[PDB]
Amino acid sequence: EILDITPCSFGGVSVITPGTNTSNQVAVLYQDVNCTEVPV
Amino acid sequence: KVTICAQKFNGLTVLPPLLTDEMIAQ
């Protein structure tokens, strides 16, 4: 039986921040990933 | 008239450009 092998997902993490002088509240971009499996 | 794979598996990320095709037409 034919088995397609795919390496399981990867992607860089983009971090959006304002100035640390302004705030420490930050946001995270997961790129090229539909966030159906976020946690790992 | 202007036309390897869509998926690459070793750290080859093509990034989306900031300015989309629609607003360049705008």
Curated annotation (Swiss-Prot), chain A:
It comes from Severe acute respiratory syndrome coronavirus 2. The chain holds residues 583 to 622 of 1273 of the full protein. Attaches the virion to the cell membrane by interacting with host receptor, initiating the infection. The major receptor is host ACE2. When S2/S2' has been cleaved, binding to the receptor triggers direct fusion at the cell membrane. When S2/S2' has not been cleaved, binding to the receptor results in internalization of the virus by endocytosis using host TFRC and GRM2 and leading to fusion of the virion membrane with the host endosomal membrane. Alternatively, may use NRP1/NRP2 and integrin as entry receptors. It comes from the Viruses. The lineage of its organism: Viruses, Riboviria, Orthornavirae, Pisuviricota, Pisoniviricetes. Glycans are attached at N21, N34. Changing Q31H: In strain: A23.1. Binds to host ACE2. RBD also interacts with the N-linked glycan on 'Asn-90' of ACE2. Cleavage of S generates a polybasic C-terminal sequence on S1 that binds to host Neuropilin-1 (NRP1) and Neuropilin-2 (NRP2) receptors. Interacts with host integrin alpha-5/beta-1 (ITGA5:ITGB1) and with ACE2 in complex with integrin alpha-5/beta-1 (ITGA5:ITGB1). May interact via cytoplasmic c-terminus with M protein. May interact (via N-terminus) with host bilirubin and biliverdin, thereby preventing antibody binding to the SARS-CoV-2 spike NTD via an allosteric mechanism. This is Spike protein S1.
